[PDB]
Amino acid sequence: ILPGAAYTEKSATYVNTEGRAQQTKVAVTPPGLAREDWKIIRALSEIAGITLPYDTLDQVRNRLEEVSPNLVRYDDIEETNYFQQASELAKLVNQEVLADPLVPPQLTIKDFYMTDSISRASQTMAKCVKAVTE
């Protein structure tokens, strides 16, 4: 096990459904011997023979620019296009739908308060569920 950090504990990008990249700012430092995640990966690499080229966070942002430069553009939605090609390209394949309905899993508010690890570990979410189911 390699303890990482949380969104309250690392400057990090998280792209939304729109595509807007958004930078977290570190509030509290992670506890114990827990560290940032890319930091752990680069340390692993240096213990191996790889030794990834970057040492700091801005270098990682340069790498993100090299891969996908929609990410450094914080709070900057960018107009995408080229849906007609995907239409032409999906019209080819022949996978058929089922004659079976589709219920979402979050069917009621009872299933909203617990969706991930953090919400699973929560006295308040559990109190809310205890109140919703009763």
Q: How far is the CB of 20 from another protein (least distance, A)?
A: 13
At 42, phi and psi to the nearest 5?
-65, -35
Residue closest to 30 by CA, chosen among 16, 53, 47, 11: 11
Name the residues that contact another protein, by CB under 8 A. Answer: 11, 23, 25-30, 32-33, 35-36, 39-40, 42-43, 46-47, 50, 55-58, 66-70, 73, 75-76, 78-82, 84-85, 88-89, 92
When the beta carbons of 25 and 98 are compared against another protein, the nearer one is 25
- The length of the chain in residues reads 134
Q: How far is the CB of 110 from another protein (least distance, A)?
A: 27
In angstroms, the CA 50 to CA 119 distance is 37
CA atoms within 13 A on the CB side of 107: 4
Q: How far is the CB of 100 from another protein (least distance, A)?
A: 28
